[PDB]
Amino acid sequence: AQTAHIVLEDGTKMKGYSFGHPSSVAGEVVFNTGLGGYPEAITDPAYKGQILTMANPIIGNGGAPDTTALDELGLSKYLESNGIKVSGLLVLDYSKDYNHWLATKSLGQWLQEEKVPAIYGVDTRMLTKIIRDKGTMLGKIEFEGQPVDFVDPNKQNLIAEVSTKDVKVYGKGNPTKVVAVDCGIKNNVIRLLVKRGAEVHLVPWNHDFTKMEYDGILIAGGPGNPALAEPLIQNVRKILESDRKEPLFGISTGNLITGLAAGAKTYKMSMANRGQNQPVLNITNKQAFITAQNHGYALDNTLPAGWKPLFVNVNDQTNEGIMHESKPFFAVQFHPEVTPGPIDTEYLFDSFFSLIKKGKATTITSVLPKPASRVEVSKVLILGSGGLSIGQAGEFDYSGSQAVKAMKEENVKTVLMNPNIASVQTNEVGLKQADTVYFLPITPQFVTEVIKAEQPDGLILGMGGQTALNCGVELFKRGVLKEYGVKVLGTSVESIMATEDRQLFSDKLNEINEKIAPSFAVESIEDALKAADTIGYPVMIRSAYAGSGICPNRETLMDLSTKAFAMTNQILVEKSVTGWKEIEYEVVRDADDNCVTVCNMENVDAMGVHTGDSVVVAPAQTLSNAEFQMLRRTSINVVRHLGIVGECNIQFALHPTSMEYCIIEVNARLSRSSALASKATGYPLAFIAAKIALGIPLPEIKNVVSGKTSACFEPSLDYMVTKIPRWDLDRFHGIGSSMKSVGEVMAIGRTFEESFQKALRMCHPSIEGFTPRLPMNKEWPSNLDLRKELSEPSSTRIYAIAKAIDDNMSLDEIEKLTYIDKWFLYKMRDILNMEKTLKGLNSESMTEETLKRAKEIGFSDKQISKCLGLTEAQTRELRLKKNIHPWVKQIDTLAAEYPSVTNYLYVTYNGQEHDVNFDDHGMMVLGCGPYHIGSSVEFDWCAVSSIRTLRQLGKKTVVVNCNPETVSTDFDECDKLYFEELSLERILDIYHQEACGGCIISVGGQIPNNLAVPLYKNGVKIMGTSPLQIDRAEDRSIFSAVLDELKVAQAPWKAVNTLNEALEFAKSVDYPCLLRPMNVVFSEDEMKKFLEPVVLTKFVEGAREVEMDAVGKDGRVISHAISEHVEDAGVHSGDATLMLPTQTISQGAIEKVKDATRKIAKAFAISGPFNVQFLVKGNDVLVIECNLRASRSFPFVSKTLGVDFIDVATKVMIGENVDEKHLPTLDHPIIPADYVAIKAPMFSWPRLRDADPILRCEMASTGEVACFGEGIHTAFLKAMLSTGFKIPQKGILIGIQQSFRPRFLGVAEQLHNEGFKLFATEATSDWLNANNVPATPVAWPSQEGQNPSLSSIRKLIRDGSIDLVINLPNNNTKFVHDNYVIRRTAVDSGIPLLTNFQVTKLFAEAVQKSSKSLFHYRQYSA
């Protein structure tokens, strides 16, 4: 492994690993922020004599193309010149292994062949920061024993060096004779001239062309001081002073020469323009363009008489082109031929030929477009996060808050609609608080009523997810918007509808020679064959539910769809693009037609499912410049053609071994995709799109991160990002295919391997990284069908991939079975080989170089610890002994071209400096990690509040979180945001690097609070309630003993190790019982199959359950709120609907809850938030459990009581005083008298589960809806409306257990008496009818087809007969899959589903009692 130093003339050294030719070379060190097209880039004649620092950290993914191949024009087929032009190459990471269809060899092999030196392993960002604003930074790549001095190659005539020595002819025989003056021309200049009918005579830089016959002249170049080419400047002068009026087109060096030849001056830029994201402005008509540039010399803006500036630089105000006021002479300083770079300025070549074809001294202005208008708005309605749709059900989207922010800045009055009263969106108090907020459902009735009342003239319907969109679309289509005179701001509804309907899209896109491949939903075999026939084979059939799924010909489609129609009514026929590269683009377009790509994402792995899961990386890694720029160009034409004014998302499928692509879809509303893109790049889409909808153009909006630059640009990422979904599963397995993606993680690295391993760890705390060793120490089965495990969906898929590599299955086979591009599989194999290396080493034999490298590819100290036989603490010690630590970098949007001084931060081992100072010494606030079941959006409310409490008292903050769906991860609302792991390791690194004053672990759910003790032992000041007490409060055995000592009752329990131990307890307290590794037991057999140390709690039936949410100070309760669950106490608990204040709890029970709490608070010395759960039966109060942290009910409680508990808690924790007089202390509570509050989940759905001692249908739930009402019954009906449901009125499906009949009959009659028609299955229906309760028989979904007297439930729900299902736990194992299906039908149809008898009762009573009655602008909130 040979090594070398890059040394700079300022003293700086960095050691690196040679992958080039192993020899020294000296030169000018430059940087370039263009991410793509390194093979094209390093053949740019412009780099002659220059050592190129690549901004992109991952170089060599595509190998090298065929470097000997010529086109029929005799130019290099794939390069921009005859060979490599850089003197040397500096990169962070070099891909040894490569994967492109055009690749013929490694980039290392190509560089050695060309005699060019290249070192990897150096900090290209530190270099950039050093080179930036320093005129000419000289340096050398030096190998030991090969010294070389510093030399400036720019003091010799580099134009001469790269210029053709003799005249060459290209496109011999064409009609239009173009003399091209070679000052370092790029091949694409030649290629684009010839394509437009030119015969191109390429002449030496000092050739005498003043007398040649020609139709047009072109001067194109790259390297060197334009001043040293004096002979050429003279020859141009002589043209200009002659009467020749043949069109003259200068590119880059052309601009410099042409300018010098007319009497202008050139300077060496102290800050050069080298990038693919360089913004220019056409002075003459105020149009903006994104350009590739590569020059460190510029033309002074004091031009001489006759000449005017044409293009100017938007970032730095330097000259970017010039024009003759009369004659057809012009120049651009940028490269319109790009290659690499954006294909946005090619029209300048058309312009050129037009100036030949006119030939009457026409001007440059004459053959382009000409000058042009914005909406006046006084009050905008913003539809916020809504309910669920009959399709894309399950989205959070609190980006309206950024929209509100945008509006306020333009003095636009704002009205926000969000039905959740405890929403993080409406928990803002500054520029992001709306002027007026309505807590109403997002439906046409309610938005119409808000319109009548508020009389807005603006609407934003594209920043509240799908439900909001459909609502404002519908409102447009009833003329409601036109009637009250409300504009749609941004993309129009016509445009939006064309994106939302597939057929309409397929038409609009056919208007510009773009094709979709229409998907067809079909109910028969012959219509499947018809659809297939229209699409063209191969094709994909997808069932609604659930090999995958593919038909190359009509034979197969029939066989497969025939199977499919024997289990369902409808299938979807689509074009098969499976195994193609999925790439997406985020695009922005303003009302002045400026258009920019902000981010791009490559799906790594779809995980064997459909959805919008997808392991994703940004930027894309495996595309060539050609492939990237084609798709970009296509995005921009589609987006222009749709008239997008705002953000768009456009997903492509790209054939993996060709340039064939197709457009999968377009979303002209904000999405998951667009949120990821904002956090990945630093570019605030939602905020910018809001400004755009007022009609403000991008160059007039500020780049919030940079400060100095505009939002009219394309970000440049000097890191890579990885995003992994968090699924709703909770166990690690190898069958089911309708899992929902309930959350996601994002991780930032400067190698793929670092990013990827962090992403893995963020996903779930018991995922160590990428290994073949399964979590929980489980072992691989010996019946293991490894091909299967790689093709079917599973929750240990990544482990299986790891195993397949480790078991020497080829990567080609893995690529074929997973569809994961082999480039990703190479990097994954590199991780597994490091682990093998490590396993053979120990604390002594392991070298600094091996450890450094392991950390640089994402190994945790824990992973290393398992290999070396150390513990984690010992491994950390070992590492710090060697001074191996990570580095704090900024995301700055521009790859360090301009410095950011906002603090959006990440931590990487691939660096040599930090990018910030550590003088703040602020208060750390740990975030919650990815949303999952149990842990939803409420802990984001808690974050915003705690952070705010610290901000408002002037305390410097440090925020840490890795959930990209969180409002709290906003660099504008804390001082330092680290977008980072919430592991012990990474939090120790940040806490100690910063020297944080303390750390708050209380306000982020379970992840940060489990770190209490480990943090405590590793030197962290944990604010509030001591981690020693947290350990005590959450050791069952210790907490139970404290409770006997305090004389506070609890249900008896016992940890057991044996079956006879278990059975003897259950006996001793009567059945039934509970379980853990929460599971139920009624009889001896469940117990029998689980451990093959289990905790056994006595179950109390018919019990109420109570949350006590509180704040302690020095052990005294200083705020509290008691809330009652609707549902009887049971295993379901963290998805219980809550009622505040209590409804059916004896007064003595309350006093006992209060007293128990006072005691618990004192026993554990609580100073901070905390929660306690209780069983209450009559007057018996039993404590269930105590969590020494904020609960999910904290926002609810706070917004109900008019007191921010998290704010009270934060103050207590930092020692700020808090006046107790108006807080809800135990002696003076706050009980609402005129209103009740309900907290319910936003979305709920069935899961078929899983361990299978019994097949069990469960409900799962996420999100929050919370409402006030006069009493609980109206609040519950408002909740129902607020989750997007219609209040039931026609009919009710009744599914109950046979044994539950006596207890249900009352409710059933009650429901029939309110005018509901009852449906049930035949046994139930009969029995209801038998008791004089009318009911219609229906059929179990299994038995559909076998009894035509009985209507199917799907028909009665399509009908509209059934608009509420009641489906209570049915332990009968025969009908479990049926009850799963009934539930599933209800949820996907969008009719309300009730699964608990108390919720059922609460509904029945509610309809008896009783949609614009219940809200009717009535007032609340104390």
Ligand SMILES: COc1ccc(C(=O)N2C[C@@H](C)N(C(=O)c3ccc(OC)cc3F)[C@H](C)C2)c(F)c1
């Ligand atoms: C190529 O990148 C990949 C592909 C698959 C996976 C993968 O196998 N999973 C599987 C699994 C760990 N996962 C989960 O959300 C998940 C997390 C925890 C859990 O049990 C507590 C179950 C899960 F499904 C994700 C879907 C990711 C991955 F982590 C990375």
Ligand SMILES: [Zn+2]
């Ligand atoms: Zn420039």
